[PDB]
Design an enzyme around this catalytic site. Structure first.
Site, mmCIF file in Angstrom:
data_model
loop_
_atom_site.group_PDB
_atom_site.id
_atom_site.type_symbol
_atom_site.label_atom_id
_atom_site.label_comp_id
_atom_site.label_asym_id
_atom_site.label_seq_id
_atom_site.Cartn_x
_atom_site.Cartn_y
_atom_site.Cartn_z
ATOM 1 C CD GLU B 171 -3.274 -0.954 1.973
ATOM 2 O OE1 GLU B 171 -3.317 -0.005 2.771
ATOM 3 O OE2 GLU B 171 -4.225 -1.768 1.865
ATOM 4 C CD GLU B 280 -3.899 -5.936 2.921
ATOM 5 O OE1 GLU B 280 -4.801 -5.173 3.348
ATOM 6 O OE2 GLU B 280 -2.675 -5.742 3.115
#
Ligand code: NA
Lengths: 482, 481, 101
Positions: B171, B280
Site C-alpha cells: 500500500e 487483501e
C-alpha cells in the site's frame, strides 16, 4: 456445438439508432466528385449527385459527421459560408489539396436534411480558437439577435439548424494532426471548449478525443468528465488474410470494454454516464495516399456486418458510431463521373439498417471458437484475439413489437453451417431471410458487374424450433412477424 | 428464471489453488495471542496455538502472506532472527505497539511448514532498502556460501526455504504508509527491487502494489510490467445491510475486470501475462482501531462464499488471493485465552476448500438479478451494482476426473429457491449436498454456541436432470460421484 | 577489509558471482605500490551513501585520529595511501547499473 436461442419477450435494452452513423471528410473525392459534383448530368440543382443521394437514402443515415477527420484541424468554417463565388480557395494541409470551399456548412446541413440525418460537426482545435468554435455554434444553433445567428438568416436560413453533436477536436494526440497536443494540453482544452460551448447551448452533446493511450484517455476523463458526453475511439483494421480481418471484430470488442472500464475508473465521468463514440471505423490497410480509395471486398463487408452486430449488443456502452467514410475516401460507395459502385461495406449497412429492431432481446449463441495472431491496418501492426466465435448473432424487435430480426454472422471461411434455432413462443409460420453474400471472400462489385456481392431474399418456414443453413462468410437477417 | 446447466466433459480452465490464500500481519492479536502464544496451555512448545493450528490445517492453506500489511513498511527483518532473547524490542509505527520480534522469519517459515502453506513474504519499502530486501531473499533462498545463506544454516536450517512469492511493498500509495510514495516513485522502485531480486533468484514471483487509482496502476505496469508477475488489489467492503454487503461480490468482479483491462493496455505487461493478486480482501466496516476484531456474521460469510465462487470462475485473471486476515485482526478465526470461535467467514473456506475441484467445467446459470445502491467499508463510501444475480454457481472437477462439485450461492434473503439442474451425461446416482447457513443473516458463532453457523450435509438422488431447493442466505456444494 | 577469513561472502549483482572479498582495499593498494601505479578508486553510488564514500576516503587518506584513519593503521598501514583519483559513481545513466539515476 452451434445453436441460437432467442426470447422475444425478454427485452435486454434499447439499441441506439446512432450506431449506424456515417462520416464525410473533405478528403480526395468524398465531397467533390462524391456526394457533391457541380454541373454533372448526374447532379441536382444543388450539385448533389442524385445516384449517390438515392444510395445514401437507402441506408437511412441517422447522423452524419463532417468535415473531418484530419482536414478539420486546419479548417476555418467561415471560409465555407456566404455567396459561393466569394469563398476563398485554401490549401488543406491534411491531404494537400486546394479546397474551394464551395461545399460548406449550409450545403452540409442541406445534405443532412435531404437524407434525414442529424448533423455531427467536428470543430477545429488545431489552428482554431474558442471564439471560432463558439461562432460556428452560434451560426448553426443561435436563435437570438447575435451577429452569427443573424448571418445564418441573411444567407437564407432563418430557422436554426439545431446541430446536436459537436466533436471537440479530431485526433489531437497524433503528430500528423495540425496543432497536435499533449494529453494535458488536450484535456484542458477539451474542458474549456466544451464548457463554454455548453454555456451558449446547453443541449449539445460533446464528443472528446480518445485513443489507444490509456493515460491520454484518463487525462481527458479526469479533466473534462464533468462536461463531455462521449469519449471517441477510432478503429481501422484489416489484412489480406480473411480470418485476420474478420476476427478483429472481437479485438474491437475488447478495446471498447477497455475504454468503458477507464470511464468507470473516473468518478465524474462514471456518474455522468459518459459513453463511447466509435466515430471512425473501417477496414483500412491497402492504400496509403491522399485519396484512400480502398477497394473493399466481401471479407471487409463481413467485418462491417460483425461490427454492426457487436454494436447492437453493446450500444448502451457505444451509442454513437460512424463508418469512415461514406463516399470514395475509405468509401462505402465508390463513384466515377458516370455512375457508382456499392461496395460490400455499403451492403452491410443496406442489410442491417433495413432489417433491425429498436430493442435488443435475449439471444444466446453456442459457437465453436478460434484463436488468432495476425496483423492489421496500413502499418501491419500485430494483434491477437482469443476465442473469437465462428458464429455470432443478435436478435432485436421493432418498437411496436410486431417484428423480430435475427441477425446472424457465419464467419466460417469454407463451410456452411446448418444451425438449430429456438425462438420462445413463436408459432409455425413463414419468414424471410435476407442474406449478404457473394462467391468468394475477395469478391467485389464493379461498374460492369454491380451485383456480384448483393443481398438475396428467400422464404422459409419457422417455428419455436427450426433450422437454417447459413452460407460461409455471410450475414443474414431472419425477419419474422410476431 | 432460475436454473443451472453443467457439462463435466467441457473443462474451461484450471482453477489456481492459490485463490484460497490467507494473510497474517503483526497487528493486534493476529500473531501474538492469535497463531502464536508463548506460555498458553493451548500452545505447543514452539508457542503455536494448537487449537488454531487444527482449525488452520482444516482449511488447507495454499499460501500465507506475512508480515504485513502496514506493519511491514517499518519492519526490519533482521530484528526477528537469531536467539530470541537477543532480538530487539521495537516500536511499530503502523499499529503503535511494542513488537518483541519473538515471532520472526524462522518461526513464520516453521508455521508455514506445519500447515503446509507456501510462504508469501512482503518486503519493507517504507524504511527498508534494496540491500535489505536482497539480504532477506538471500537468507531465505540462498544455497551458496554467501553471508545470509550461511546465517540461515547457522540459526538451524541448512536447507533453503525457497520462498516463491515476494510482495514488492505494501500500500505504498497511502499517506498512512510509512515512507509512502508517488506513483512515479513507486513504479521506479518496484522495477528496481524486482529486477535485482530476480537477478539473485529468477524463480520468484513478484507482486507489485496496485490500487483504485488507474494512473498509479498504469505507471506501475508501464515501468515494471517487464519484470513483475502480479499487480495487487485490496478490497474491503460491507455495511449493516445484507444486500449492500453480499452484492459487492459483483462490485469486486467489475473492479477486477477493470484492473485486467489496464494490464491489457500496457504492451509489456499484456505480453508477459501479468495477472492480479487480490492479496487483501474481506468485509471490514464496523471497527476502526488498532485490533480490528470485526464480529463477522453469516451475511459476511455469504459474501466470502460469493468471492470464492467468483474466484473459481476468474482465477485465470486472479490466480492469487489472500483473505485479510487469518486470526483476530479482521479475523476468520477469533481466539480467546481459553478457546476459539470459527466465524462464518472461516466457514466459507471450510465449505469451499474441502469441496472443490482443480478444474472449472462449463457452467451456465439462469438467474433473476437486482440493482442496488449502498455504502461500503469503514468510511461508508457509496457504491452501486447493476444486475447482481440472486443465484450464482461454479462447477468444478477433481484432477483425476472422479468427482464433480457444484458450488451454489443463494443470495436470496427472503426465499428458498427450487432450482432445476442439468448435468450433461450424468447417470442416476446419490450425491451429498454440503450446506453452509444459519437461523438468520446476522447469526454468529460463539464460545458457548460454536455451531450456530455451520456446514450440514444431506444425501440426495441426482440425475442428468434434477431439482434441489437452496435455502435463503446459503452456500451449498453438491458433491457428485 | 580486515582479517581475510572474517570478510563476508557477498553476491555481486553485476556479474552474478559469489564475491569472497579476499581481495579488497589493502590488497589493491599493495598491488598498485608493487607495480608503481597511482590508485584510482571508484565509489558506490548505487547502493552506497555519502557517509560510506567519505569513510572510504578517510580510511585511505586520513592523517588524523578519526575512526577510519585509525582503522587503516590497525590493519597494518600507519601511513595514508594518498589515493588521488576518485571516480564519482560508474555509468549511473545506464539501466543496467544498480541504483541508476
Ligand atoms: Na446534455
Amino acid at each position: 456445438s452451434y445453436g441460437i436461442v432467442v426470447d422475444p419477450k425478454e427485452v435486454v435494452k434499447p439499441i441506439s439508432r446512432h450506431i449506424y452513423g456515417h462520416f464525410t471528410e473533405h478528403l480526395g473525392r468524398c465531397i467533390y466528385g462524391g456526394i457533391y459534383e457541380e454541373g454533372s448530368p448526374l447532379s441536382d440543382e444543388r450539385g448533389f449527385r442524385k445516384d449517390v443521394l438515392e444510395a445514401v437514402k437507402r441506408i437511412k443515415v441517422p447522423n452524419l459527421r463532417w468535415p473531418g477527420g484530419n482536414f478539420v484541424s486546419n479548417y476555418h468554417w467561415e471560409d465555407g459560408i456566404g455567396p459561393k463565388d466569394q469563398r476563398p480557395v485554401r490549401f488543406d494541409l491534411a491531404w494537400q489539396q486546394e479546397e474551394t470551399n464551395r461545399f460548406g456548412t449550409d450545403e452540409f446541413i442541406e445534405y443532412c436534411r435531404e437524407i434525414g440525418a442529424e448533423p455531427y460537426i467536428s470543430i477545429n482545435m488545431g489552428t482554431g480558437t474558442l471564439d471560432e468554435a463558439l461562432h460556428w455554434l452560434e451560426y448553426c444553433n443561435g436563435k437570438g439577435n447575435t451577429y452569427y445567428a443573424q448571418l445564418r438568416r441573411k444567407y437564407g436560413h432563418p430557422e436554426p439548424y439545431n446541430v446536436k453533436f459537436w466533436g471537440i477536436g479530431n485526433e489531437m494526440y497524433g503528430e500528423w494532426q495540425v496543432g497536435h497536443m499533449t494529453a494535458d494540453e488536450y484535456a484542458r482544452a477539451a474542458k474549456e471548449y466544451t464548457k463554454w460551448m455548453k454555456v451558449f447551448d446547453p443541449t449539445i452533446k460533446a464528443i472528446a478525443v480518445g485513443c489507444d493511450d490509456p493515460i491520454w484517455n484518463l487525462r481527458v476523463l479526469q479533466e473534462a468528465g464533468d462536461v463531455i458526453d462521449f469519449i471517441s475511439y477510432h478503429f481501422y483494421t484489416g489484412s489480406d488474410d480473411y480470418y485476420e480481418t474478420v476476427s478483429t471484430v472481437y479485438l474491437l470488442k475488447e478495446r471498447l470494454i477497455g475504454v468503458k472500464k477507464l470511464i468507470d475508473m473516473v468518478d465524474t465521468a462514471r456518474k455522468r454516464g459518459v459513453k463511447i463514440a466509435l466515430d471512425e471505423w473501417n477496414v483500412w490497410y491497402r492504400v496509403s495516399d491522399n485519396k484512400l480509395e480502398e477497394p473493399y471486398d466481401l471479407k471487409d463487408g463481413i467485418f462491417a456486418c460483425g461490427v454492426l452486430v457487436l454494436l447492437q449488443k453493446m450500444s448502451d456502452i457505444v451509442p454513437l458510431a460512424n463508418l469512415a467514410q461514406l463516399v470514395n475516401a475509405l468509401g462505402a460507395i465508390h463513384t466515377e463521373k458516370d455512375g457508382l459502385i456499392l461496395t460490400p461495406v455499403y451492403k452491410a449497412f443496406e442489410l442491417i439498417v433495413n432489417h433491425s429492431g429498436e430493442k435488443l432481446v435475449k439471444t444466446h449463441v453456442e459457437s465453436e471458437t478460434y484463436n488468432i495472431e495476425g496483423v492489421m491496418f496500413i502499418n501491419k501492426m500485430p494483434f491477437s484475439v482469443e476465442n473469437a466465435p465462428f458464429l455470432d448473432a443478435a436478435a432485436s424487435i421493432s418498437e411496436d413489437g410486431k417484428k423480430l430480426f435475427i441477425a446472424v454472422v457465419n464467419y466460417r471461411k469454407e463451410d456452411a453451417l446448418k444451425v438449430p434455432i429456438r425462438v420462445e413462443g413463436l408459432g409455425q409460420k413463414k419468414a424471410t431471410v435476407y442474406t449478404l453474400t457473394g462467391p468468394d471472400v475477395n469478391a467485389r462489385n464493379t461498374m460492369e458487374n454491380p451485383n456480384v456481392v448483393d443481398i438475396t431474399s428467400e422464404t422459409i418456414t419457422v417455428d419455436t424450433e427450426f433450422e437454417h443453413t447459413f452460407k460461409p462468410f455471410s450475414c443474414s437477417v431472419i425477419e419474422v412477424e410476431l
